[PDB]
Amino acid sequence: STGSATTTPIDSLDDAYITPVQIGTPAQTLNLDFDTGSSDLWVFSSETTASEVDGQTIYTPSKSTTAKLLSGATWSISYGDGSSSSGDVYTDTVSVGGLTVTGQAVESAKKVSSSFTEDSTIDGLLGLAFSTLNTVSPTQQKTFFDNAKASLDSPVFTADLGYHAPGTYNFGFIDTTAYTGSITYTAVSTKQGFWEWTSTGYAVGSGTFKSTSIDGIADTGTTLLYLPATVVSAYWAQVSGAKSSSSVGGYVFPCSATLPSFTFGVGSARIVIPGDYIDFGPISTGSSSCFGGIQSSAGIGINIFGDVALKAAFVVFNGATTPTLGFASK
């Protein structure tokens, strides 16, 4: 089997991407944030504290003839950005882009933090990291990909995120029309539950490539590119007036600037992030200070190849017995 679904930016900045997901019978379609950095499929629901729902579409398990309470199961998750959610668990039929899994754990939120409430466009998350990170207790549950894998034509999914435009998540096949040149594959460590890999270096603009190992995660659920402070300083030093602002929480730059590109290495191959992908717009409405899309990972404890980086590539998440990651230009 295969599936193919369009993923759409939630706003004009590509702060996140949403993908429609069918849950239950008859189908209830919710727009979920596909997150290769976590492993829970959770939704706003009829059980979510009413004051914490503001515009989201909810899953109502009592209206699904295939929903079954997973007795005694609870979940609770905290994300890198300080947001969180928790609740109980149903199993139900879940379909993405024509690919159907029966008995998928659908984690129903009883509580969500303010950042989720405040984002009316995201109805929940669909985790695509390794199932070892799934938070359901006392019986850990599998991700949608893990459940689908054996049925797929090939045990892979691909992320093809757009810049200020829709893109595609495919399951079970590699669309050879979706990228240019060849896909370069690179080793993955699953030790921390992530799609963790080692970039071979970087360049800033038309500058020379610096060969250096950068361990980090391919994370569709993180907006920005988080790299070591040395790398980030070297990038922003090429932008007149750019500075790290403690009050804003990272690097900002004059909105009048033209940003240089940023290149990262994948083995001997190179992915080029155009400068415009690094512009996240005014820090507040009407400001001439703009937020940067490349930020320091210092104090995160891990480097994160988030959407800024991934949207410059066609990315293969290869879930073969030994997982790997593939990157192509597009």
UniProtKB/Swiss-Prot annotation:
- Judged by the first EC level, this protein's enzyme class is hydrolase
E.C. number: 3.4.23.22
Give the active-site positions: 35, 199
Q: Does the keyword Disulfide bond apply?
A: yes
Give any GO molecular function from the UniProt entry: aspartic-type endopeptidase activity
Which keywords belong to this entry?
Aspartyl protease, Disulfide bond, Hydrolase, Protease, Signal, Zymogen
Its protein name is Endothiapepsin
Name its species.
Cryphonectria parasitica (Chestnut blight fungus)
User: Gene of origin?
Assistant: EAPA
